[PDB]
Write a protein that binds this ligand. Structure first.
Ligand SMILES: [Zn+2]
Lengths: 192, 297, 108, 166
């Protein structure tokens, strides 16, 4: 059932609609409903090429912003990632754009929410299991954005970033213990 | 109570101990994190992110340094002495106690309990099989006395003999052979019903477990094991059985008039590797340890 | 006198790799009970000595500030004081040097 | 110039099958162009060669040689990178498998001997190579006993044939 003060909800919808209108004004013949499938498949195959370690394809699939965010902390480790099931069809939750004049470039950013399950198991440089589990399709709720360069004549739809609200459940623990040292004092006194 | 060979008794005791340990490891489904703080004096402010009921204060010492592992004899989990291989349970604060600390009384008591347990393990497996050898308990004598003690009741046929110097040296040799193999002092906290069902045979051990589970509202008694020997003891123990450097058995004494049967008290003195004494001082301690010590009231 | 022949690598290895020329392992090393910074037996801990030396240097700088110039050496005893820490009745005739600090929990 | 010790940490192993030995971690580290003689560095490396990380640091802290502090620094960075990069949980659970010194690029200077004669001085440099393996140090090989001596003598006697005949 709808909640009170739906005028602001409709105003947010209208802001997303005017962003979509600008995107359509720049480029026509762009349906809205088929996007979530495209984003889902792009996400799945980008993570597949991450598992296979194919940077020449991961570059075409994801943007330069999230290329290092996704490839740097995993350089010398082995990943076993696999999409198993789509729980519910993804929903486009936000469509915004900016009229940035610094280089005559306008970028369209669309956030789409997906709820699904996957199997992640990060191994070590020596082949030892580090973080994940092999065959336990744990459920994850993720909001990922996609950015396109409208002014560019080619402009592949690539994933830009992933947003995480603070209320999100904590991810699974680490299989190894960690020591966090206190202050490393020179000849002095400790106050705590 | 029925007929059972001592060998099969030890096998079944070990199987029950291992089954209980397995279920204790299993009732926790996943790895949980504990933030164990270091309230010691040398490395203050150090927090370890350890695993619940898996990791140990020895593992915390492994994180810190090798000197911690070598010298730390006991842990202090927010108020209390913990043996070095007891898995941690809650987010706590820890402090490591060595033999040369300002107040080493807790580690002295733990070391003497461990030495008494080793002496009992040596005694139980050094007599003829057709005699019934039973361990009564290890009295909590203070370190200020001359030696640690173990009470043992022998079969009726041995109510008139006395072991000689050669037999005493054989006991010391068995103790040194036990020392030579690095055996961790494994610990376990079990329920009263399980504690009774492990032993099930000795009425002395049964009453010991009753006395040790009465004062605890949760009816839990501590259990410790070296190799395949299992004893019931009060208080924690030292991590390894090779911590002892000088070990001996001095003499055995009788206390008859308090019971129709006979209860013998084996006595022995030991000194750790960190506190080894000279030959002459050790001879003095050996000569003193042969005296009967009566501290039970 | 000149060498009649070149020394071989085998002879050289035998000379310069025998136990007399190797570094010996020392077993004087244990942990400092305070500060736990790996001192050596029969030798003061470097960490604790550096702490004491830093405090002594600060005290001596205050002494030089108070004394004025050279050739002073007051003919009375001396006592170091800290924040708060009102002077005691026994140290009346003594010179007082109070720089500014909380008294360290090793200097009493 | 060759820098191959640096690239030994870039090796990536395939994931182990569940039922397999732990495959202890293996960390390579080095310092290049140390203003020290390589023989003088070899003595310290030889001392450090078999020890665990903590014992080696303890031994190097109370050696009054120029290279002792350099090797101590190298070992400290190796330990830090072993815990941080190569997934070693216990910072004290490392031992030294390889510890050696190598010649570096040197310079040549004139010495001005006591006539119109002279010598060429060499400004010595060296490298230090260390390798840490995760796990307790391996036990030292005990000296062979008289039982082993007699056993090998008997086997030598039993192995002999009738030579230069059928
Ligand atoms: Zn110190």
């Amino acid at each position: 059932e709808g909640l009170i003060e739906r005028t602001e909800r409709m105003k947010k919808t209208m802001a997303s609609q005017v962003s979509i209108r600008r995107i359509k004004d720049y480029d026509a013949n762009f349906k809205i409903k088929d996007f979530p499938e495209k984003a889902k498949d792009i996400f799945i195959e980008a993570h597949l090429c991450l598992n296979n370690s194919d940077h020449d394809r991961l570059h075409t699939l994801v943007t330069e912003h999230c290329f290092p965010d996704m490839t740097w902390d995993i350089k010398y480790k082995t990943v076993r990632w696999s999409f198993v099931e789509s729980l519910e069809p993804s929903h486009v939750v936000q469509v915004r754009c900016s009229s940035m004049m610094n280089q005559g470039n306008v970028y369209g950013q669309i956030t789409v929410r997906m709820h699904t399950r996957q199997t992640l198991a990060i191994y070590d440089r020596f082949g030892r299991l580090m973080y994940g589990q092999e065959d336990v399709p744990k459920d994850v709720l993720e909001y990922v954005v996609f950015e396109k360069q409208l002014t560019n004549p080619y402009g592949s739809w690539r994933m830009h970033t992933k947003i995480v609200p603070p209320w999100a459940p904590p991810k699974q623990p680490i299989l190894k213990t960690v020591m966090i040292p206190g202050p490393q004092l020179k000849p002095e006194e400790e106050y705590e | 109570a029925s007929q059972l060979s001592p060998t099969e008794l030890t096998e079944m005791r070990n199987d029950l101990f291992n089954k209980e340990k397995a279920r204790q490891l299993s009732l926790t489904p996943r790895t949980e994190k504990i933030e164990v703080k270091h309230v010691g004096k040398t490395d203050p402010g150090t927090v370890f992110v350890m695993n619940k009921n898996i990791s140990t204060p020895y593992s915390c010492a492994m994180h810190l340094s090798e000197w911690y592992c070598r010298k730390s004899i006991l842990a202090l989990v927010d108020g209390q002495p913990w043996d070095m291989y007891k898995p941690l349970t809650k987010s706590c604060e820890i402090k490591f106690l060595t033999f040369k600390d300002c107040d080493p009384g807790e580690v002295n008591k733990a070391y003497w309990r461990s030495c008494a347990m080793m002496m009992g393990c040596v005694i139980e497996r050094a007599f003829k099989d057709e005699y019934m050898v039973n361990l009564v308990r290890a009295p909590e004598v203070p370190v200020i006395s001359g030696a640690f003690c173990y009470d043992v009741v022998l079969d009726s046929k041995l109510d008139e003999w006395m072991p000689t110097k050669e037999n005493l040296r054989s006991f010391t040799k068995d103790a040194h052979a036990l020392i030579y193999k690095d055996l961790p002092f494994e610990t376990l906290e079990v329920e009263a019903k399980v504690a009774l069902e492990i032993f099930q045979h000795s009425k002395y051990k049964v009453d010991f477990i009753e006395e040790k589970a009465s004062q605890n509202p949760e009816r839990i008694v501590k259990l410790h094991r070296i190799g395949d020997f299992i004893d019931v003891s009060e208080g924690p123990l030292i991590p390894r059985t090779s911590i002892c450097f000088q070990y001996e058995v001095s003499a055995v004494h009788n206390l008859q008039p308090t019971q129709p049967s006979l209860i013998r008290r084996f006595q022995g003195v030991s000194l750790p590797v960190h506190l080894r004494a000279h030959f002459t001082i050790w001879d003095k301690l050996l000569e003193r340890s042969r005296k009967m010590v009566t501290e039970d009231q | 006198a000149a060498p009649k022949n070149r020394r071989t690598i085998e002879v050289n290895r035998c000379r310069r790799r025998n136990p007399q020329k190797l570094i010996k392992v020392k077993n004087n090393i244990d942990v400092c009970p305070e500060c736990g910074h790996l001192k050596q037996k029969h030798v003061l801990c470097a960490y604790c000595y550096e702490k004491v030396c830093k405090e002594t240097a600060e005290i001596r700088r205050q002494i030089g500030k108070q004394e004025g110039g050279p050739f002073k050496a007051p003919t009375i005893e001396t006592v170091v004081l800290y924040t708060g820490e009102t002077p005691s009745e026994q140290d009346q005739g003594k010179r007082i040097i109070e720089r500014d600090r909380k008294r360290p929990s090793w200097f009493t | 110039i060759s820098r191959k010790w640096e690239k030994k940490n870039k090796i990536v192993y395939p994931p182990q099958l569940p039922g397999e030995p732990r495959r202890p971690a293996e960390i390579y580290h080095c310092r290049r162009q140390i203003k020290y003689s390589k023989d003088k560095m070899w003595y310290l490396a030889k001392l450090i060669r078999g020890m665990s990380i903590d014992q080696a640091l303890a031994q190097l802290e109370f050696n009054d040689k120029k290279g002792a502090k350099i090797i101590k620094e190298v070992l400290l960075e190796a330990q830090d990178m072993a815990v941080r990069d190569h997934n070693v949980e216990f910072r004290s659970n490392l031992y030294i498998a390889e510890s050696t010194s190598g010649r570096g690029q040197c310079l040549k200077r004139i010495r001005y001997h006591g006539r119109g004669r002279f010598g060429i001085m060499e400004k010595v440099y060296c490298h230090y190579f260390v390798k840490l393996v995760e796990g307790p140090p391996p036990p030292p090989e005990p000296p062979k006993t008289a039982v082993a001596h007699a056993k090998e003598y008997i086997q030598q006697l039993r192995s002999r044939t009738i030579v230069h005949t059928l």
